[PDB]
Design an enzyme around this catalytic site. Structure first.
Site, PDB file in Angstrom:
ATOM      1  N   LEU B 123       0.684  -1.184  -0.086  1.00 29.54           N
ATOM      2  CA  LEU B 123      -0.147   0.109  -0.013  1.00 29.54           C
ATOM      3  C   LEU B 123       1.082   1.160  -0.078  1.00 29.54           C
ATOM      4  CD1 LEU B 123      -3.640   1.051   0.119  1.00 29.54           C
ATOM      5  CD2 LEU B 123      -2.601   1.256   2.650  1.00 29.54           C
ATOM      6  N   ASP B 124       2.098   1.938   1.064  1.00 21.26           N
ATOM      7  CA  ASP B 124       2.522   2.524   1.257  1.00 21.26           C
ATOM      8  C   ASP B 124       3.621   2.127   2.386  1.00 21.26           C
ATOM      9  OD1 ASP B 124       3.627   5.414   1.270  1.00 21.26           O
ATOM     10  OD2 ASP B 124       2.514   5.609   3.142  1.00 21.26           O
ATOM     11  N   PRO B 125       4.689   2.097   1.732  1.00 21.95           N
ATOM     12  CA  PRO B 125       5.275   2.239   0.557  1.00 21.95           C
ATOM     13  C   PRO B 125       4.896   1.127  -0.810  1.00 21.95           C
ATOM     14  CG  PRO B 125       7.255   1.555   1.298  1.00 21.95           C
ATOM     15  CD  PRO B 125       6.218   1.406   2.394  1.00 21.95           C
TER      16      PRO B 125
END
Ligand code: PRO
Ligand code: PRO
Lengths: 439, 435
Positions: B123-125
């Site tokens: 998702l993030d990163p």
């Protein structure tokens, strides 16, 4: 092992999917729409039969006699025709719609024939009865009494698809829906019959609904809430409130169309355009780039910019052709579907909120709340189709398997019907929870 | 046709399900937790391997050599140990987490070995890079430049499960997320580096996010947004801003705990929450004036939040290393994800693209996902599936690039963004011209 599905529309698809899992039933389908039944026959294994209900009653009598159960997914005006065949041929029936006064007259004949006819299944009327009676029966089991019953339900888009002036998307033409804003609402509040006037003043009764902090909703009472005292059997209750849920700014946007004079069944006035139509309503000649704006903004609530921008966004002031229709209301409805339709991969959402005030014999007042929420599947059915469809299909399966022994015309009020259905809907992706506090 | 999945957490479940669909790969799993790997071994057909990465480095070297690809779902500090085995044995790798400075030093050895290592997925990163570079490459394809890049993301409960003081539910003990309020925020805006302090004054930086009218969100900036200029190659931009999304009232509730002095690591003092709260502000009964006086100028919302959770009650305080960690064990008990409660991911990017024509393009990108009742969570899918898809692309022989890298090239992000729609992760695009 044989069932007839009268209807081939929105609700029929999830009903066929549920019954076809087990793989021991000959599913026949009857409908008017030839394009729908052929496409539906490709997906699911069924026996397609072209058959009108009113005009071709003869073949209906012969066809219904062969089957075990009849799933009627037609408009509620045609149920007496379907029920008449069942009582003569001696076969069961299930419905996903209102039990009308016409169908109530057959109740004497239905019990004599010795068959089961369940009605009022689906979302509303349907799951609203099941959640209510579960909680009311639980109260009366422990000697408690129902003092208040506040209920709210709304079929909406998922929050991510709410970025438009109405915060809404239509599945079909809202001809019957938009005219109900003009109707009044009646309900009980602390032993007093409250009456709310419809139309222009109905925006005053639209209140904020903050039971889910993350979800920005509004609510309002609808039609008649006093009816449910005799049905659920809670005449002792001092409060009875039934309402609809919408996203905030929905009713205020519709109130703008009432101010402009679009919500009426009067006839329309080179093809006609929307710029030309609003000039006739406000009362000027059709020739105005920004002069109709000054005329429209003056009429809309004495300078309401949000209502002006909503009409600007939909293109009611701009140059677009008006669709061919019998009235101004039908022209607006057709345009709203064209502008605010559901996409190919866009979810919908059902939310239902009940709130009970239950006085126990000990003296304490119980505050019981019930939440029911369901989202539409991306690679599957919509939440509205599932909630309307699955309770009808589950109830049909109970009759074939032999889990319902009662006879005559009836709703889903008895624990024999609602108990099994509420338990099975968890597996289908419709979750409901309970919270209780005492004071 | 063989792969090793290091780690046995909640991220591994969607990865194992995706790879086991076709039935043409012998999947192996290695982990410390004996309870997890046994329960995980029941669902999916896998070879269980009881081992420690740090204690038993010898067996790692022999085990990795047998496999075609490695999938690291371990904490990001331990990647150099896995990477060291990969370069020696000459085996490909994928990671669902940050490419740290330590892993960057190995890049010279990785290129000489002639193998592919793909970091920063999930998702993030991960998906934040993919959505960004899809839009930036399209702009540069027509000679345009990026002037503004404002982005927001957030993992939080579904709207129906938000009726509580924080409007949030925790999966595990929140240690870092509470302490992150004390840390400062830095970002670029109109050609100048802005700085915002943590603590009491951070609540002023919170603003309402009304991009979806039906959803009631707020937002605030992350620790650092200036690093994304060099990463995506947009030094020309005058505004850079990466932020977090929550429901309204979250940060205001957390600000109340900062006022009372709960968020601090200085050790603990049968103790109860009634006794602990009096020491910060034992004492007599009631004394609600002491709590509300210190907690702002008569803030009733922040006071009732403490009463609801039961910080004035007589409940027992768990054994913890500090007062901050003690509050973490209490919040994870009260505010927690149940068995039949769904979560949600919401992601919102906003671009200001200047074309050589002169016009300004305002482009927006939405990515939303919900958890499944009879399936995986929204957090598990969005973190897990991009790494699982990247693992499949290496085995099939699609990714021809070599060396250490992220998902910045169209070779990587293009196929992944196309395939996520089928998994129940919808993302949309909208664009308008503004002279
Ligand atoms: O008005 C709505 O959205 C739904 C329809 C049935 C009951 N409530
Ligand atoms: O803090 C949050 O909620 C988001 C989730 C993924 C990255 N940060």
């Amino acid at each position: 092992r044989k069932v007839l599905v009268l209807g081939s529309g929105y609700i029929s698809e999830p009903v066929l999917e549920y019954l076809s899992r087990d793989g021991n039933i000959e599913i026949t389908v009857g409908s008017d729409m030839k394009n729908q039944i052929e496409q539906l026959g490709k997906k699911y294994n069924i026996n397609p039969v072209s058959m009108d209900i009113c005009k071709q009653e003869e073949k209906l009598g012969f066809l219904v006699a062969k089957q075990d159960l009849v799933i009627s997914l037609l408009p509620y005006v045609l149920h007496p025709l379907v029920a008449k065949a069942c009582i003569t041929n001696k076969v069961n029936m299930v419905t996903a719609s209102y039990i009308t006064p016409a169908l109530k007259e057959l109740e004497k004949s239905v019990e004599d024939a010795g068959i089961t006819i369940i009605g009022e299944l689906g979302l509303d009327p349907g799951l609203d009865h099941m959640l209510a009676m579960e909680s009311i029966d639980k109260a009366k089991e422990v000697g408690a009494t129902i003092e208040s019953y506040i209920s709210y339900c709304g079929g909406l888009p998922a929050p991510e698809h709410s970025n438009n002036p109405l915060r809404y998307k239509f599945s079909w033409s809202p001809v019957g829906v938009l005219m109900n804003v003009m109707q009044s609402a009646t309900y009980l509040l602390d032993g007093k019959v409250v009456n709310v006037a419809g139309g222009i003043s109905f925006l005053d009764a639209v209140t904020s609904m903050d039971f889910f902090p993350g979800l920005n909703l509004e609510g309002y009472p609808n039609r008649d809430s006093t009816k449910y005292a005799e049905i659920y059997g809670i005449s002792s209750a001092h409060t009875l409130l039934r309402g609809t849920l919408r996203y905030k700014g929905y009713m205020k946007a519709l109130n703008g169309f009432v101010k402009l004079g679009l919500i009426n069944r009067e006839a329309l006035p080179n093809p006609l355009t929307w710029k030309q139509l609003l000039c006739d309503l406000v009362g000027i000649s059709p020739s105005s780039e920004h002069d109709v704006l000054k005329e429209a903004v003056l009429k809309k609530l004495g300078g309401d910019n949000t209502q002006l921008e909503a009409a600007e966004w939909l293109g009611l002031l701009g140059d677009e052709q008006v669709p061919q229709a019998e009235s101004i209301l039908d022209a607006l409805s057709k345009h709203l579907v064209m502008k605010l339709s559901y996409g190919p991969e866009e979810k919908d959402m059902i939310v239902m909120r009940d709130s009970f005030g239950i006085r126990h014999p000990s003296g304490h007042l119980e505050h019981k709340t019930i939440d029911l929420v369901a989202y539409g599947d991306i690679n599957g059915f919509s939440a509205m189709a599932k909630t309307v469809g699955l309770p009808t299909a589950m109830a049909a399966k109970m009759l074939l398997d032999g889990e319902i022994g009662a006879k005559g015309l009836m709703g889903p009020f008895s624990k024999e019907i609602y108990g099994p259905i509420l338990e099975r809907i968890k597996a289908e992706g419709i979750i409901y929870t309970t919270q209780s506090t005492i004071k």
